Design a protein around this ligand. Structure first.
Ligand code: GDP
Ligand code: ADP
Ligand code: ADP
Lengths: 332, 340, 238, 318, 322
């Protein structure tokens, strides 16, 4: 059997297989009915189907055979400056347009232009986006650009004005869980109760991350070889998520407020290898959404967590930061 | 050789602690062709490198231990020459790109590429993956995407937080917790039975484990040092032997606690200079000083909270700074002020 | 000729004078003059200020403020200035922050601890310590390169953990066995591809109660001569 | 009739006496040129102050006619490589030339602090080998980064930022050379804007002459693209934070001034607030520098300036 | 043709707002002399418009064969534009007398070496060719090239002139613009006429009926990809009035569904809060300091959810001071 990531294995092939993006699919179908395809700005929460929808539109345009020749897929966060991405775009545009075959012409409405897709375009700097706008202006005759992003507001106005914008709604929990369940049933993945829900919660609704985590869990279960169902602890381990019992013990140690007990527990915890950033994130999730804490406590603890996260992002010692954060929370 | 190196497990069957991880590694090695990229994260001196070498031995045979060290020369675009120490075997390579600092990225983009041109696959071990720059990590992700056919990466780190998300998604996360005190005691008992060391009681070994704070390498070296000091006859009254820098740091902590003045700060400056001039890292000094100060029994809760807050602040400043003595002296001065 | 080397001392002495920080002293000697004093020698003034700001008797202490609080504030500012200097001297070349660095490294810490020089203006000791640290790090890198195939550790782990036991396996047997431990020491060195130069370098890394200079000097010269003769008389692994 | 030339290049210092700042360094260079026998030198200072210009003036005063081929300028950070520039230096040194007996060839190396220890050792060896023929002058931002043998063999020279008196003297000399109507406030404004940058001050004076002719404060601040110092002073000294924010939003942010110019002018004005206590001025300068560092890292939004004003007001009102 | 080129004024008399610079250049135009000019300032002020208007006024109808306009940041490279400049300088015509005119737009994007090469070429062809340098900032240009040209600064256009130009464009294109849409467009463009014209053309393109339909503020905000004031006001109201859970849910939902980045949300919230009448100065101090700290931390990366909750907590704690 061939090996392929399940993210690219289960991408929808045509626009009719997009589940929850009714508005974007309808607008894209209307645009496809028109003889001219403008520049496109696909924006929305991650794992909603932006890349899937643009790939489906590209296939319905060029045919399954000629799609690969007419498409340049790039990631906008590529390092070594904007120069590498812009030069690749220039080389793709200067390259001669492949002649469609008789079968492709008679079966699909092949347009003269080629499509360049940029992923995570919102991560580009302002100068990089201005250079991309210049390149799009120069080669507007033969190349149509599709910019995929999470935040449309991170794209400069001069670049955004040239693009017709498609907003993708966040996938409902039922739709994402049904997609994950269908993928698991197709691949004969055995899962316990609430395992897919735990995967969705860890991925924060991102279906790409959920599918990747499900594939990783299936691989781990195959490695184990006992034939038992995948459990929540396994997927927590694979995603680097601290178990809930340890977080509850941390919360209780904070509540007691003894400095020596907290220091001893943090010393014991740092030996287990759990990531401190995951601990800070889960403490934030627990405390902010908890109804047993008043407004002042949350006001203080949000700043405490923000300071701890900012210091952790600088590449510091996890033990000291975690102990300081826990002590400061316990003094609240 | 030293007991820490003579009795290092040379195979997956020779591992004695973290049984679940050993079984997982055996299952992983059972299918060499479908071996994923691995990222082993855990505390220092727990056996990550030993487990990586044992997995490589399970895959490619004992020949992975025929290690030869060479120096590879690279040219970066400003026409600058860099030298990287590469430990290679007929089956795998080991690199520590962080030794090149910000110049790690280009080095990787060379060396891995060269191996991909030379090549079923060759395993590349990357040490201190958490200290790689973000550009180097992006280049590593690119090489994972491109040369996955011939390159399988095994990264080792103490903290997975500095690792970027795209690297994490494409690699298998392996958590390596530090062994419990019972496992450390069992390992030390095996070592002393192999070396014919007299023990009044096994409790001494337990104490050594409690002194190592879960660091198996530290516990083994401490056991060897204690055996050497006591003429290969360990007694229940044999004191725990600590390294010189730890003793100096404890003396500095006692000095700081006892007296708080400008002259004491001046002498602490000389102590810190002595520590820094002999290859003791600033972060290590700060961590040891802070956790020695927090262990003083005469300090109240407020003093310890102030100490830990200043430790966090000056640890961030050390990570963002260039001159270590500046931040260390600032931290010590703040602690001295807070103790009064 | 020699006054060029005296210029940093003069700058440090002038900037730590408490007179120029009172109201009248500030009016006569403005902040522009102090930043100009920094820019007279922008290589040594931060180092001299960091070196000599603990040797003053302050006359600018606020009411209710002790000397220790002032030196703590000065050290806080000095560390901030060190961060600024790192950002300036990085590949970004943010030289426009040179004035700010001044205030963060020379002017503000001097303001907090300005007074009378209790002693003498000492030259900065950071340069020599930095050179010493670089030399010892090169030595540690060489030792790690030699012993990498036998030890499962990084360079820092080699310094922190392995070297204390290498001391007991390479130097301690001499003090108790005379020349009888030469064979064992040579065997231990051969197990890790350690040369006589590496043996000399290893003993220089220890601090505090583990310093080996006096201990090695107390070793009889006959024992050392026998050790080097036996090492030179036999071939060793490479 | 001839092609026009900018004043920065026309009145650039050509001889040693034309340099105004660095009295000690210029005096030592003049003595060395007077008695001949130029020794090996290193010169350290912040970039953009004219170390290369001073060593070129010394080379002129030494050689004269033979300056065209007797001086080689090279950058140690050149992308061609350290080995290539070392070979070029060797070729230049081995090139025989009939100089006067008391003179030697001159090599001016830039960014010598960026070289590795081995490269510096090789350069020292080459300098020793060709000592009788060519003498070396190095320019570095960090004097301490140079290895000890090079520092011991080479003389020490330090170039520093020009003081306001030197800038005023040079501006007066230029005004005497080219007939320009000027006023005291205009020259004070030019000196205030150019913080020891002689080239920037000369360019600003030339632009003011070209645009308005007469050099007064209003014309200088119209030519200069930085915010007007009085507006920044009003923003900083406002007793109400709302007034400061209002001034920042209307007179500075909406006028197209970049955040870098705003923070630089705030630093300049705060440094000269004689009516404010010096400790308060130092606190304000610390806050302004923190926001300047934040802006230089990419985040140069209006919120950073507003927070700077808020912190300054908090310091002012205690 | 794009609306930027088609609405460029034909003569110098039609340029608004820049009367001082217009008169200063018109002195040279009347004198029949052209020195090296360098127009610097924000985009959309009319530098290209003014220079092409004066070029047409000077050279008559034959300016096509007498002047050459090029973009200095062109993707073909510095070599191609340099060769074209040298070819135009070397080319001579029967009626070519005095100075040929070459315009280089956005010259500030060139590197130092490219600017030096351009200066050398200009000095080579000074006797028979004159050049214009259009840049956003003069300081971006190297001083060596900067000193060679007479500098002219452009100041952002007054709001009344922008409104008049917008009305003229609307009546020429038969477009109907709501007053709220006009205010939103003026606020977003902050005086950049290029942005105004581009957004107007794109909004006309998006209309299903280019004549009957009217462009609303929603269309303008969608076209510019900017946060709507209504969304930011709703988020601020939820933060100020609702409890922590409701505020957290509202902030996350709004900034995820509408695709608003946290930094843009912070900027918009600050802009809205500027108009608030606060009884205590400490509220404003805390708001500004904490929000700037959060934005600076955002610029370095970090945890997004934690930063959002930090924004919520900072606003709540600051407004606890009434
Ligand atoms: N007997 C025994 N010793 C072990 C085992 N795991 C680790 N060790 C010892 O502990 C040390 C671990 O150091 P290392 O492999 O570098 O761990 P790392 O630095 O955290 O990656 C080695 O020197 C081994 O001798 C084990 O399973 N059994
Ligand atoms: N509307 C949808 N219907 C079905 N599957 C979807 C949908 N949206 C996302 N997916 C799944 O997500 C995976 C890839 O997500 P992707 O489209 O790359 O996320 P993004 O929107 O960030 O580009 C595919 O395997 C696909 O099955
Ligand atoms: N001051 C002005 N007076 C009249 N029209 C203007 C003015 N500024 C800009 N415009 C209009 O805006 C359009 C684009 O401005 P443009 O001159 O291209 O800006 P830039 O200077 O950035 O090139 C022109 O068509 C012009 O009609």
């Amino acid at each position: 059997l061939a090996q392929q990531p399940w993210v690219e294995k289960y991408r929808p092939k045509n626009l009719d297989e997009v589940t929850a993006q009714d508005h974007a699919v309808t607008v894209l179908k209307k645009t496809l009915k028109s003889a001219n395809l403008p520049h496109m700005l696909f924006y929305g929460p991650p794992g909603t189907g932006k890349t899937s929808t643009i790939l489906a539109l590209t296939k319905e345009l060029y045919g399954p055979d000629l799609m690969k020749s007419r498409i340049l897929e790039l990631n906008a966060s590529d390092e070594r400056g904007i120069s590498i991405v812009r030069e690749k775009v220039k080389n793709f545009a200067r390259l001669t347009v492949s002649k469609p075959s008789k079968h492709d012409l008679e079966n699909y409405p092949c347009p003269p232009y080629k499509i360049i897709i940029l992923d995570e375009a919102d991560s580009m700097t302002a100068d990089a986006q201005s250079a991309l706008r210049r390149t799009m202006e120069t080669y507007s005759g033969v190349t149509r650009f599709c910019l995929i992003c999470n935040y449309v507001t991170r794209i400069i106005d001069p670049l955004a004005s040239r693009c017709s914008k498609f907003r993708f709604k966040a996938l409902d929990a039922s739709n994402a869980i049904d997609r994950l369940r269908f993928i698991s049933e197709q691949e004969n993945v055995k899962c316990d109760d609430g395992v897919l829900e735990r995967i969705l919660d860890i991925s924060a609704g991102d279906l790409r991350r959920g599918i990747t985590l499900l594939q990783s869990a299936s691989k781990g279960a195959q490695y184990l070889g006992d034939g038992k169902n995948i459990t929540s602890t396994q997927v927590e381990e694979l995603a680097g998520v601290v178990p809930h019992d340890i977080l509850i013990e941390i919360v209780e140690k904070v509540k007691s407020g003894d400095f020596d007990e907290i220091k001893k527990y943090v010393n014991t915890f740092m030996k287990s290898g759990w990531s401190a950033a995951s601990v800070v994130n889960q403490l934030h999730e627990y405390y902010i959404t908890n109804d047993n804490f008043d407004t002042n406590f949350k006001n203080q603890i949000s700043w405490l967590l923000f300071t701890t996260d900012s210091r952790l992002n600088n590449g510091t010692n996890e033990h000291i930061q975690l102990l300081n954060l826990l002590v400061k929370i316990s003094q609240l | 050789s030293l007991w820490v190196d003579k009795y290092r497990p040379k195979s997956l069957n020779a591992l004695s602690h973290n049984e679940e991880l050993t079984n997982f590694l055996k299952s992983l090695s059972d299918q060499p062709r479908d071996l994923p990229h691995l990222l082993l994260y855990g505390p220092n001196g727990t056996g990550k490198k030993t487990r990586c070498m044992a997995l490589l031995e399970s895959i490619f045979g004992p020949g992975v231990y025929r290690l030869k060290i060479d120096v590879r020369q690279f040219v970066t675009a400003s026409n600058r020459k860099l030298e990287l120490n590469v430990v290679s075997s007929p089956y795998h390579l080991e690199i520590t790109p962080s030794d090149m600092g910000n110049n790690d990225r280009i080095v990787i983009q060379e060396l891995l590429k060269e191996v991909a041109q030379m090549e079923r696959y060759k395993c590349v071990i990357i040490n201190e993956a958490n200290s790689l720059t973000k550009d180097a990590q992006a280049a590593l992700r690119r090489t994972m995407e491109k040369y996955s056919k011939n390159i399988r990466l095994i990264m080792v780190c103490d903290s997975m937080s500095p690792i970027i998300a795209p690297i994490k998604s494409r690699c298998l996360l392996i958590r390596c917790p530090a062994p419990s005190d019972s496992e450390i005691s069992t390992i030390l008992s095996d070592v002393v039975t192999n070396e014919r060391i007299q023990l009044e009681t096994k409790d001494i070994l337990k104490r050594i484990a409690q002194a190592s704070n879960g660091n198996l390498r530290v516990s083994l070296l401490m056991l060897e040092s204690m055996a050497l000091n006591n003429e290969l006859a360990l007694k229940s009254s044999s004191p725990i032997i600590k390294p010189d820098w730890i003793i100096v740091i404890h003396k500095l902590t006692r000095k700081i606690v006892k007296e708080r003045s400008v002259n004491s700060l001046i002498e602490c400056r000389a102590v810190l200079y002595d520590l820094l001039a002999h290859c003791i890292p600033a972060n290590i000094i700060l961590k040891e000083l802070t956790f020695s100060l927090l262990d003083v029994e005469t300090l109240n809760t407020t003093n310890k909270s102030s100490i830990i807050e200043y430790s966090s602040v000056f640890d961030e400043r050390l990570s963002l700074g260039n001159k270590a003595i500046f931040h260390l002296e600032g931290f010590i001065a703040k602690v001295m002020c807070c103790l009064d | 000729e020699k006054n060029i080397a005296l210029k940093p001392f003069d700058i440090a002495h002038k900037m730590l004078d408490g007179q120029i920080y009172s109201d009248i002293g500030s009016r006569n000697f403005t902040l522009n003059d102090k930043i100009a004093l920094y820019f007279d020698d922008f290589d040594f003034t931060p180092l001299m200020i960091q070196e000599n700001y603990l040797s003053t008797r302050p006359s600018v202490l606020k009411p209710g403020q002790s000397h220790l609080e002032a030196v703590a504030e000065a050290a806080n500012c000095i560390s901030l200035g060190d961060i600024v200097e790192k950002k300036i001297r990085s590949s970004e070349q943010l030289w426009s922050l040179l004035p700010l660095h001044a205030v963060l490294s020379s002017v503000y810490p001097a303001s907090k601890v300005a007074g009378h020089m209790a002693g003498r203006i000492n030259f900065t000791a950071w340069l020599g310590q930095n050179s010493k640290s670089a030399k010892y790090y090169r030595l540690l890198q060489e030792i790690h390169y030699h012993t990498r195939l036998g030890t499962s550790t990084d360079k820092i782990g080699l310094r922190l953990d392995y070297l204390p036991t290498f001391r007991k396996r390479l130097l301690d047997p001499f003090l108790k066995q005379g020349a009888d431990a030469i064979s064992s020491v040579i065997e231990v060195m051969d197990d890790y591809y350690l040369t006589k130069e590496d043996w000399d370098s290893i003993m220089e890394f220890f601090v505090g109660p583990d310093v080996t200079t006096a201990i090695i000097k107390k070793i009889p010269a006959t024992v050392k001569s026998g050790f080097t003769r036996k090492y030179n008389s036999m071939t060793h692994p490479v | 009739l001839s092609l026009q030339l900018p004043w920065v290049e026309k009145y650039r210092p050509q001889v040693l006496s034309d340099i105004v700042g660095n009295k000690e360094t210029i005096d030592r260079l003049q003595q060395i040129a007077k008695d001949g026998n130029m020794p090996h030198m290193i010169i350290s200072g912040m970039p953009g102050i004219g170390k290369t210009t001073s060593v070129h003036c010394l080379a002129h005063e030494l050689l004269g006619r033979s300056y065209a081929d007797g001086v080689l300028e090279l950058n140690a950070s050149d992308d061609r490589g350290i080995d290539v520039v070392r070979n070029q230096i060797k070729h230049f040194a081995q090139k025989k030339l009939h100089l006067p007996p008391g003179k030697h060839k001159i090599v001016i190396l830039d960014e010598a602090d960026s070289m590795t220890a081995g490269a510096q050792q090789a350069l020292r060896r080459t300098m020793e080998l060709y000592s009788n023929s060519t003498r070396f002058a190095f320019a570095c931002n960090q004097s301490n980064k140079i290895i000890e043998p090079l520092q011991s063999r080479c003389a020490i020279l330090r170039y520093s930022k020009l003081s306001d008196e030197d800038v005023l003297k040079r501006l007066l000399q230029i005004i005497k050379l080219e007939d320009v109507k000027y006023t005291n406030d205009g020259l004070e404004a030019i000196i205030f804007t150019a913080e020891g940058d002689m080239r920037q001050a000369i360019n600003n004076l030339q632009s003011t002459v070209a645009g308005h002719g007469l050099v007064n404060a209003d014309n200088v601040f119209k030519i200069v693209d930085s915010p007007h110092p009085l507006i920044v002073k009003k923003m900083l000294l406002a007793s109400n934070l709302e007034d400061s924010i209002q001034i920042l939003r209307t007179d500075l942010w909406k006028k197209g001034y970049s955040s870098i110019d705003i923070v630089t002018t705030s630093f300049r004005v705060t440094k000269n607030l004689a009516q404010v206590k010096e400790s308060v001025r130092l606190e304000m300068i610390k806050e302004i520098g923190l926001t300047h560092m934040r802006i230089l890292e990419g985040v140069g939004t209006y919120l950073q300036l507003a927070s700077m004003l808020a912190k300054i007001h908090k310091l002012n009102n205690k | 043709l794009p609306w930027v080129e088609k609405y460029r004024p034909e003569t110098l008399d039609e340029v608004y707002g820049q009367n001082e610079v217009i008169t200063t250049v018109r002195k040279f135009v009347d004198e029949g002399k052209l020195p090296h000019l360098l127009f610097y300032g924000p985009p959309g002020t009319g530098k290209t418009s003014t220079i092409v208007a004066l070029a047409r006024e000077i050279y008559g109808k034959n300016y096509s064969n007498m002047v050459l306009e090029l973009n200095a940041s062109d993707d073909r490279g510095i070599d191609v534009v340099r060769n074209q400049i040298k070819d135009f300088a070397s080319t001579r015509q029967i009626f070519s007398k005095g100075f040929k005119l070459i315009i280089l737009d956005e010259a500030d994007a060139m590197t130092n070496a490219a600017q030096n090469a351009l200066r050398r070429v200009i000095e080579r062809y000074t006797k028979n060719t004159r050049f214009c340098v259009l840049a956003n900032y003069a300081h971006k240009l190297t001083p060596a090239l900067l000193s060679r040209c007479t500098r002219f600064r452009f100041q952002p256009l007054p709001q009344e002139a922008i409104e008049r130009r917008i009305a003229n464009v609307l009546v020429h294109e038969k477009l109907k613009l709501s007053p709220n849409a006009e205010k939103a467009l003026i606020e977003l463009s902050n005086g950049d006429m290029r942005r105004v014209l581009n957004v107007l053309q794109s909004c006309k393109a998006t209309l299903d009926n280019p004549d009957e339909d009217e462009i609303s503020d929603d269309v303008i905000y969608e076209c510019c990809g900017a946060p709507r004031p209504s969304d930011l006001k709703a988020v601020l109201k939820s933060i100020l009035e609702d409890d922590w859970g409701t505020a957290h849910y509202t902030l996350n939902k709004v900034r995820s569904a509408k695709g608003l980045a946290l930094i843009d949300l912070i900027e918009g919230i600050v802009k809205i809060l500027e108009d608030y009448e606060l009884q205590n100065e400490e509220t404003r101090v805390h708001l500004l300091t904490k929000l700037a700290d959060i934005e600076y931390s955002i610029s370095k990366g970090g945890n997004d959810q934690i930063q959002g909750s930090a924004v919520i907590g900072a606003i709540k704690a600051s407004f606890e001071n009434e």
